């Protein structure tokens, strides 16, 4: 992983995004969403991520 001052960015496009595999995971200590509910992500479409 990158240092925070030199953070990495990856563009994601043209694909199917399953967000429930991440949200329903027991391995993450923090999972916070803004401007959107974490339980509605699978019903949405975006231009880029």
């Amino acid at each position: 992983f990158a240092s925070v001052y030199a953070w990495n960015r990856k563009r994601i496009s043209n694909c199917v995004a399953d967000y429930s595999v991440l949200y329903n995971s027991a391995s993450f200590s923090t999972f916070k969403c803004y401007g959107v509910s974490p339980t509605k992500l699978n019903d949405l479409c975006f231009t880029n991520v």
């Binding site: 019903d43 949405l44 479409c45 975006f46």
Partner: protein
């Protein structure tokens, strides 16, 4: 339609959409026509009586 939700009657449109155009808009900023993401058919959206 690709995350665009609403209620209404869908019919074949006579609107001459250009190949790059995906949907039409009214003055109320609502969608009144869409291109179907699978058939690329243009449909008119009319509110239910």
């Amino acid at each position: 339609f690709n995350g665009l939700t609403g209620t209404g009657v869908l019919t074949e449109s006579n609107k001459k959409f250009l190949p790059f155009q995906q949907f039409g808009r009214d003055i109320a900023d609502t969608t009144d026509a869409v291109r179907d993401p699978q058939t690329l058919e243009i449909l008119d959206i009319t509110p239910c009586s």
